[PDB]
Amino acid sequence: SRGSSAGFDRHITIFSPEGRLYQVEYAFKAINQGGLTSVAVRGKDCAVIVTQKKVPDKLLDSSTVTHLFKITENIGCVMTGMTADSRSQVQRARYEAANWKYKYGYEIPVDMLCKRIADISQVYTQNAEMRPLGCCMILIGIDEEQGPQVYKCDPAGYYCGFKATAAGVKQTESTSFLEKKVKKKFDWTFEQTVETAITCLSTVLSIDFKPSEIEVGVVTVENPKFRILTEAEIDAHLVALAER
Amino acid sequence: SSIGTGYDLSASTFSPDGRVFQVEYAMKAVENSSTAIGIRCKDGVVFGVEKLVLSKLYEEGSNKRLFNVDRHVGMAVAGLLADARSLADIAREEASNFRSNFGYNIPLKHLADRVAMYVHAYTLYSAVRPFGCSFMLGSYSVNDGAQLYMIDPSGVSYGYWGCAIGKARQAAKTEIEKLQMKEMTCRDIVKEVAKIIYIVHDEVKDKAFELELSWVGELTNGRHEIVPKDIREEAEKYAKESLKE
Amino acid sequence: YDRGVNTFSPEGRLFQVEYAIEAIKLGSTAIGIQTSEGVCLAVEKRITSPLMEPSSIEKIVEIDAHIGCAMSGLIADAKTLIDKARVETQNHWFTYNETMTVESVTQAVSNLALQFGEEDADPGAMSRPFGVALLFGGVDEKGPQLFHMDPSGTFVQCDARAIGSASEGAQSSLQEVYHKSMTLKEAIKSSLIILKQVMEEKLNATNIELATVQPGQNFHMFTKEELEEVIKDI
Amino acid sequence: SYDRAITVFSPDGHLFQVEYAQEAVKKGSTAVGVRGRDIVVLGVEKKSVAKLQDERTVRKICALDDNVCMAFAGLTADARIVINRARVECQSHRLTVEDPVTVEYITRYIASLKQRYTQSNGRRPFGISALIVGFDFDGTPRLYQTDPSGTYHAWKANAIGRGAKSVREFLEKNYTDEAIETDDLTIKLVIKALLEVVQSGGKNIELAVMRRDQSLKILNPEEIEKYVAEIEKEKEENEKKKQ
Amino acid sequence: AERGYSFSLTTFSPSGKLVQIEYALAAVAGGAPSVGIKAANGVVLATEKKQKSILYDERSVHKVEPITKHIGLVYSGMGPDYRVLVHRARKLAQQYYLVYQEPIPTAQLVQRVASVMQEYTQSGGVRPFGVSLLICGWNEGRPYLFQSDPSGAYFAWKATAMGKNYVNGKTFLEKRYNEDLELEDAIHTAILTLKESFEGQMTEDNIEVGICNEAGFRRLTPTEVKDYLAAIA
Amino acid sequence: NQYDNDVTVWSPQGRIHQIEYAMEAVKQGSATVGLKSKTHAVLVALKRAQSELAAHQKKILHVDNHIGISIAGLTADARLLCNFMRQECLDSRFVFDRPLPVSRLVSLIGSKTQIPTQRYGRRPYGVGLLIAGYDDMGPHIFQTCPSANYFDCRAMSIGARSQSARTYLERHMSEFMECNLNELVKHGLRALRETLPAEQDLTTKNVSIGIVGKDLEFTIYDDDDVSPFLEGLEERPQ
Amino acid sequence: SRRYDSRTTIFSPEGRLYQVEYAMEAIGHAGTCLGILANDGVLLAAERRNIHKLLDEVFFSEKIYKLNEDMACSVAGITSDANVLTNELRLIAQRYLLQYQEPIPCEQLVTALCDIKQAYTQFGGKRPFGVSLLYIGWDKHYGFQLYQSDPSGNYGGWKATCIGNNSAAAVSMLKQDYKEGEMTLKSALALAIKVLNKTMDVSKLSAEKVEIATLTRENGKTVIRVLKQKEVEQLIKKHEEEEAKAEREK
Amino acid sequence: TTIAGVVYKDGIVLGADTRATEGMVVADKNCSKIHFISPNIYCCGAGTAADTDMTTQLISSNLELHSLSTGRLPRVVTANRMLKQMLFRYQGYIGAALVLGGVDVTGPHLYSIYPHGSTDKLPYVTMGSGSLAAMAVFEDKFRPDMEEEEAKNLVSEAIAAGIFNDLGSGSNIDLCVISKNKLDFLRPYTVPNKKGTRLGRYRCEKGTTAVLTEKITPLE
């Protein structure tokens, strides 16, 4: 054992002799091929997403380059990994949300959306005909009673709620940073949250970004509609970090 | 960047380093294809295609790599041709169905998203193979503006100001970045397109070729049309003369 | 190494079809001769035991009163095509009230050519080609006709044709002795001669079968005595 | 559903699955059959005489209808399937047509069935061979045999299963119009043929006979012992006082 | 476009083994440990819900799930598979209730779920579940504790353990536990057998516990688990 | 050798070997040529016989009154495609009461033939076609490959040793648009002739001709109805 | 797809089905199970592999399935497959009962299941059911009956037989001791205890290790009972007290 | 049948009668017409009895699944949606007339649901053959923001109006009170109806019935 293989356990989603699923792990590796890193932080009264916006060409309409998506007017998501797979999963999420509201008469909770997507991914995990998606979804939104919500789902079918998470290349390091900065116990405010996420990403890649190198999604209790920050307000958040 | 031990026989299989090699190979089939470029300005979008002639027996305008997807939407392809045609049929049907269901001309970004999801659907299973082609969609409206999108075999769709696909991709792009298309008009652009094509063409390896040109903009009232023989030959002349420097 | 049944060879052929062609080369040899007086079909029975009733061996059957068929190779596979041909003729009669042309029947059977495959098909579809070669002998408005068909689906009209294990030799022998003005008697005679040449056993009345189709007479399978009268004139 | 080509052509033009099926038949209990004038007899060899086993539950000689009986060799389960299908068809023939069933007809049905299983996706050839025996209206007695390929032929006498070649040779040398001139002589010929490959007993031989418009008759080991006794007697009253 | 592989991915080896099932069992015997104890007046299920960071919100996903009002579940092995099985089990329970207007007996639920598990060892294009289940229930006065494995086989237990170090937990149970125990004592020895492995400080948020008496199945509050984890109460 | 057996498998260099192997099936067939004037479209095809006692293979098939084809490759796939084309033409006449435009029929063939080059367990059509037609845009010669690609030709030739014909045609293109029917069929026959050794030549036994035009429905000539065309050719000597 | 297909319904060059044989190998490593016929009844006796100190025991049995009011069965191999097959058997019996309003003859039930198993061997591309079965029952046609079926869909009727681990030895022993037409439930019980005592790896033999069921005919009704551990211990003690009796003579 | 529902300050009062008729003959004197949907949601049923039974049970089941998955208490809108969509799909062929009431995170909610799939959200609703009488009671004596006992009195009064003025209704009165933190499933509220005491003893003595055949079967 300890890395043993038998049959096609490295080609399709069947068990390795030590009970692993190699294709799933390979999907996790496929997430990093994008070369991007996303940070998600939950506040006392909000939830914030931030992601690198690598546009190496001026021949692109920046306006069309985004890993932030509106799933519902009050549910936002960030995708990390293979692009097309990400958009596919986004479409599926949107459909599941709309259908949810249509059948049940109320807005879908982030919890249940994430659980649904993960449940779907598990099928790819257990059936041989198709391969898992090389993407990772992080959802943010305000629930009716539980407050702000940050959830995340895997190509493995795992899903969970977090105070803070990250995805992509600088994942483990971002987790280390965030789990260090959570133990402090500070007034998790709107600006505190935004700054925390931005600085996490920045220090983890070390940049002091331009306002055109990242994108910031956000959702608040006072304003539950998922809002994508203009480059202007992003910069407004940037210059405030170079003061202390 | 080259693992082939059974890990590259199906699109339902990841490589141990997290890659799908079938899609990469289809992309490679696109890379071996003649170059096609498209560029967006302030009053529309222009397409140019280097259509390699394999025989003098073929008629003028055979194997067109420029398509009318909708009356307001044009399509430029590169790669395995039959695949490109099939995708053109798909795009056409999507646009048609959109009109029948919603009453108006399909927005370009939406058509792009739809066809791209369709393309992505072929990169997941062993039962089918990825499309061996990349394509550009161009459109113009007064309510949306001029728009140009590009889609690759993986299913990725992006919006561009200028784009190119095929053999001389990067060279073409370098030639394109010299233009200030955000201020020029399609008229001025046609010449530059033809020019970049004639530059990027390799007369040594590839023999004779034919230039395809497509309008879509305010000059055409939103209708994607072929460039008139006049403007075409004008641009070609401008190109040939610009080639001697 | 296993590949699909619909895989091309680098030469541009279907492996299964070619292997089927190979499978024919083991079949009992058969001879057909076309003549303005009629068409004759002769085939060896290949009895492998005195205990086997030879009358239960039919490698020549009636498709219809004006069309016969001689088969070589995997007979079990041939039975299906024979039945399909008969049904086809009867449907044509039903619909149009007129007999089928030999070429039309032949074409009909040939339509079941490359109708095999794995994926994207009915659950009752063929998995492999038919390992059988056919010789259709008939009479219509264009007179006496003779056609040949192989597992490739390609069918062609022939003046004199041999199929089976001793195909090449018998075909050469046929070439040496055929002209577009023979009598039916000369045709039958020749057929029996070449057959005796290529057969490993001694030619006799209960060792081959012979059938004719003439413009004035429906499909006729020769009886034992009728065979004896011909074998007499060796 | 499962749509995969199981039976395919080999480069030399062979249908390997069908050949392996025929091997499976070749591993079967020996079964022989002979045709007489007013009697037809079929006998099967090794009954896997475990003695702890109910013989009735393991007979290899079934009846398809009142008119037609059958023996087999190969995979007993496959045989059960083919047999029952043949029975259904035997009845459906009576439904669709007022007349009963000819031996050649049911033989043709079974054969076509096997051939169909040699050429259909997902399916696997029946690994059995059958000896079909009957009396048709008009009174002509008939014996046919089928094969995993779908081919079928009429015989005067034949054998299938383990050592079919040996018993076939014996039958070739012994089948006369003198033998099988009486029922008791044809049955004797069958027992004589079977004892040439069996482990020499009589408790290891099953024998069934059909005759005229009468039903199938299975022979109890007492009668079989009697026949084998007259056999050993004639094998010592025409073979002992000579050599 | 897509259809489906129609052949078995789980086949017999020449030794007579169903290799994929045993590899699935290997996946089970690599997951966080779980304990189940049937105790005269009730049943206890407990498991190691040890996260990997302080960032994980442990108040969002659970390992001890209710199937109905009188049946509970825990697992060892892969999470997502377990989640699937939980949905399916709930559905089965509700079908039973729709047909009989009577809460589903624990054994019947176990049998149906086990049938579902067996399907994925023979049907086409799928691998077996990498999950062993512990199912507790209250029906017909008596308490019930079952375990179902990836082969689709199930066993009734008085007490057992699964996951990492399940053998030593099993022995520990065989010695330091027996019948005539009240549910409280059972919870005690359950947290005790989980503690025979829980590398680190076992807090009220490091483990999850569920109970099943004749008042219904329920998950224990973190407070109650703290009181129990005070090595007392 | 692992990228050889399935059409759904790209090679690491951006090729599909099953498609190319399928393309090779065209070259195994007897040569055929097709050319057009400004009024007429002509297919000329070299038939081919197994033995001398067998007739020569049909090479030209009738599709509709204004459309005919010449085949090269697997004959079964040829008849398949032929039936497809016939049905499409019939459908068009049934619904619109006007003949189906040739370019659209060709496009339909492309669409239909592309499909199995993307599905597992499916194979490409092992046949190349030359299509002669006449419509509102005049005469037409089209070429269809197993790759599901198609070409609008001014003239073309496919099959074994068809490169020679291709060269000859490539020489006399500028003449074709103004030729008369007799001269057009002549040129086609010469193109077909250059595909033979000096030992063998055209006959009324191994040549089929197909013509369609502004004053002539698609028609097939062979045997003795070919003689008027051949008896008017220059005995090209080695 | 053609690559991953293990080809389960395919002949081997020697003319055999590999998966069926391998399944038989799986059966060989399962709990020993035997059945013996008598004149006044018929019985099943099987080794219990579910023998651990912490098992709860909530079922009437472990390897003895009731199929019908006149019929019962025991099993050997993979247990889940056994659950499937047993459920299906019950279904078949009830279908026959619904159709003819009388109990299904045992042979018909066995054949009905065996055709399903055979079907699994011939087409579908699925693995076969790694299970052999022993059937005991009574009917108005053949009275008391014992049957046996293998994963090939092949079945046979027996007067005595065994299945599972060390089956061959058990069969030889049965061939020695059996008593055609002279069998009683008591004698057959003794024989079962004997063979089970020799074949079982773990000697001494506790009732915690064996499971016995009898099928008998009382007053027009059919009675199927599983022996309580007490009766079993009586039988074992009887066996030892007879074994220590014949060893005195030397 | 007379069923009603009302919205008061702290929640919802549901009411129903208990008579089940087959034609113009009383079959049941104590039929339960108030059905459990979820712990916080209840449903009165008129129309085709079997249809209301199965509809209400099915929705209860699906809602239990829903809440089990969500870990939250079901909403009334959800029940309304499920019911109305199921019913619309069947085009009135499922004769379920319903009064649906419950308490949510968003508060108390009362819908009336018709067999064709139309719904109405109203502070007070009535369904059934006796619905017009009950509606009269409501339209005469209803005020918004009533207290619990007042609401119970009003609803019981409406159900009574139905009982005494409709031949389809009768017997007892069932109430179900649902508040933000209480559930009073009073069954029955008050039986304003009684069979008169038997004046005679029509008791038959042993042996008065002639017997042709007897057969005793001992059990266990």
Q: Which burial class, exposed, middle or buried, applies to B85 when counting CB atoms under 10 A from its CB (0-12, 13-18, 19+)?
A: buried
Please list the alpha-helical segments (H only) found in chain C: 15-24, 75-96, 102-110, 167-177, 184-198, 224-231
| Main-chain phi, psi angles of C218, to 5 degrees | -65, 165
| Domains in chain F: boundaries | 1-238
**Is G1 in CB contact (< 8 Å) with chain B?**
yes
Whole-number Å distance between alpha carbons of C201 and C192: 13
The answer to whether D1 contacts E7, with C-beta atoms less than 8 Å apart, is: no
Question: In chain G, what residues touch C2 (CB-CB under 8 Å)?
Answer: 2
Q: CB–CB of B67/B88 below 8 Å?
A: yes
Whole-number Å distance between alpha carbons of C189 and G67: 73
Active site residues of H: 1
Structure tokens belonging to residue B72: 């307001």
The alpha carbon of C198 is separated from its chain's Cα centroid by a whole number of angstroms, namely 17
Question: In chain F, what residues touch G2 (CB-CB under 8 Å)?
Answer: 121
The alpha carbon of G4 is separated from its chain's Cα centroid by a whole number of angstroms, namely 36
The sign of the dihedral angle between the CA atoms of C62, C64, C70, C72 is negative
**What 3-state DSSP class applies to A163?**
coil
What topology is assigned to B1-245 in CATH?
Answer: Glutamine Phosphoribosylpyrophosphate, subunit 1, domain 1 (3.60.20)
Q: E121 to each of B234, E8, E22, E151, H142, how far by Cα in Å?
A: 70, 8, 11, 7, 64
Q: CB–CB of A146/A116 below 8 Å?
A: no
Whole-number Å distance between alpha carbons of E116 and B60: 64
Whole-number Å distance between alpha carbons of H100 and H42: 6
Q: What DSSP character marks residue D108?
A: H
Contacts of G50 (CB under 8 A, 6+ apart): E155, G62
Query: With respect to CATH, is domain A1-244 assigned 3.40.640.10?
Result: no
Structure tokens belonging to residue D243: 């050599």
The sign of the dihedral angle between the CA atoms of D190, D195, D196, D199 is positive
Whole-number Å distance between alpha carbons of E104 and H93: 31
Distance from G12 to chain C by nearest Cα, in Å?
A: 15
Buried b (16+ CB within 10 A) or exposed e, B166-197: bbbbeebbebbeebebeebbbbebbbbbbbbb
Q: CB–CB of F181/F195 below 8 Å?
A: no
Whole-number Å distance between alpha carbons of D12 and C21: 10
Please list the alpha-helical segments (H only) found in chain B: 21-31, 81-102, 108-120, 169-176, 186-200, 229-242
- Domains of chain D (ranges; CATH) run 1-243 (3.60.20.10)
For strands B66-70 and D61-63, give the pairing. unpaired
Whole-number Å distance between alpha carbons of C102 and C211: 16
**Nearest CA among C133, C131, C126 for reference residue C154:** C133
Q: Which burial class, exposed, middle or buried, applies to G182 when counting CB atoms under 10 A from its CB (0-12, 13-18, 19+)?
A: exposed
How far is the first Cα of chain H from the last one, in angstroms, to the nearest whole number? 45
Q: Which burial class, exposed, middle or buried, applies to D95 when counting CB atoms under 10 A from its CB (0-12, 13-18, 19+)?
A: exposed
Other beta carbons within 10 Å of C190: 21
Please identify which residue in the block is written with the tokens 């033998």: D179
Residue D208: enclosing H or E segment and its boundaries?
Answer: strand D206-210
Q: CB–CB of H78/H70 below 8 Å?
A: no
Q: CB–CB of C20/D12 below 8 Å?
A: no
**Nearest CA among C30, C9, C14, C27 for reference residue C152:** C14
| Neighbours, chain F (3 or more CB pairs < 8 A) | B, C, G
Other beta carbons within 10 Å of G59: 10
| Main-chain phi, psi angles of B62, to 5 degrees | -80, 150
Helices and strands per DSSP (H, E), number in chain H: 4, 12
| Main-chain phi, psi angles of F212, to 5 degrees | -140, 150
Q: Residue E155 is nearest to which of G7, G26, G55, comparing CB atoms?
A: G55
Q: Where are the beta strands (DSSP E) in chain F?
A: 32-36, 40-46, 60-64, 67-73, 127-135, 138-144, 150-153, 155-158, 207-213, 216-221
| Domains in chain A: boundaries | 1-244
The alpha carbon of B98 is separated from its chain's Cα centroid by a whole number of angstroms, namely 22
Whole-number Å distance between alpha carbons of H64 and H35: 14
| Main-chain phi, psi angles of B134, to 5 degrees | -115, 150
State this model's resolution in angstroms.
Answer: 2.6
Q: G181 to each of D52, E182, F28, G40, G147, how far by Cα in Å?
A: 12, 57, 77, 11, 18
Q: D205 to each of D31, D63, D130, D183, D193, how far by Cα in Å?
A: 10, 18, 18, 18, 11
Q: CB–CB of C155/C110 below 8 Å?
A: yes
The sign of the dihedral angle between the CA atoms of F95, F98, F99, F104 is negative
**Nearest CA among F160, F121, F163 for reference residue F18:** F121
Q: CB–CB of C18/C150 below 8 Å?
A: no
Q: CB–CB of C163/D47 below 8 Å?
A: no
- Max CA distance (Å), chain G: 69
Q: CB–CB of G215/G223 below 8 Å?
A: yes
Residues pairing with H3 in the sheet? H16, H127
Whole-number Å distance between alpha carbons of B78 and D48: 71
| Neighbours, chain G (3 or more CB pairs < 8 A) | A, B, C, D, E, F
Residues of C near D (Cβ–Cβ under 8 Å) read: 4-5, 15-16, 19-26, 49-53, 55-57, 74-77, 79-80, 116, 118-119, 121, 123-129, 131
Structure tokens belonging to residue C51: 């205990």
Cis peptide bond prior to D125, omega within 30° of 0: no
CATH of E1-233, one of 3.40.1010.20, 3.60.20.10, 3.30.200.20, 3.30.43.10: 3.60.20.10
Q: CB–CB of A148/E116 below 8 Å?
A: no
**Nearest CA among A163, F225, C15 for reference residue E53:** A163
CA geometry: angle F103, F106, F109, nearest 5 deg: 155
Contacts of F147 (CB under 8 A, 6+ apart): B82, F19, F22, F23, F117, F124
H76: Cα within 13 Å, side-chain hemisphere = 25
Restricting to G residues 49-88, those with a Cβ less than 8 Å away from any Cβ of E are: 50, 53-59, 78-81, 83-84
Whole-number Å distance between alpha carbons of A92 and A107: 16
Q: Which CATH class is domain C1-234?
A: alpha beta
Residue E185: enclosing H or E segment and its boundaries?
Answer: helix E183-194
Other beta carbons within 10 Å of D201: 13
Please list the alpha-helical segments (H only) found in chain H: 49-70, 76-89, 131-141, 148-165
Distance from G250 to chain D by nearest Cα, in Å?
A: 32
Please identify which residue in the block is written with the tokens 């998950």: E219
CA geometry: angle D22, D173, C55, nearest 5 deg: 65
Question: In chain B, what residues touch F152 (CB-CB under 8 Å)?
Answer: 58-59, 61-62
B141: Cα within 13 Å, side-chain hemisphere = 16
Nearest C-alpha in E relative to H54: E98
**Is G203 in CB contact (< 8 Å) with chain B?**
no
What topology is assigned to H1-220 in CATH?
Answer: Glutamine Phosphoribosylpyrophosphate, subunit 1, domain 1 (3.60.20)
Question: In chain E, what residues touch D5 (CB-CB under 8 Å)?
Answer: none
Alpha-carbon Rg for chain G, nearest whole angstrom, is: 19
For strands B225-226 and C30-35, give the pairing. unpaired
CB–CB contacts below 8 A, C to D: 108
Q: CB–CB of B39/B181 below 8 Å?
A: yes
Torsion of CA B219, B225, B229, B232, to 10 degrees: 70
Q: Which burial class, exposed, middle or buried, applies to G33 when counting CB atoms under 10 A from its CB (0-12, 13-18, 19+)?
A: buried
Determine the residue type at H203: R
The answer to whether E61 contacts A179, with C-beta atoms less than 8 Å apart, is: no
Q: CB–CB of A141/A47 below 8 Å?
A: yes
How far is the first Cα of chain D from the last one, in angstroms, to the nearest whole number? 67
The string of DSSP letters for B223-244 reads --EEPPHHHHHHHHHHHHHHT-
Q: CB–CB of A103/H81 below 8 Å?
A: yes
Residues pairing with B35 in the sheet? none
Q: By what method was this entry solved?
A: X-ray
Query: With respect to CATH, is domain F1-238 assigned 3.60.20.10?
Result: yes
Please identify which residue in the block is written with the tokens 């065994």: G162
**What 3-state DSSP class applies to E101?**
coil
Q: Which burial class, exposed, middle or buried, applies to H216 when counting CB atoms under 10 A from its CB (0-12, 13-18, 19+)?
A: exposed
Determine the residue type at F163: Q
Q: CB–CB of C127/C30 below 8 Å?
A: no
Whole-number Å distance between alpha carbons of E151 and E18: 9
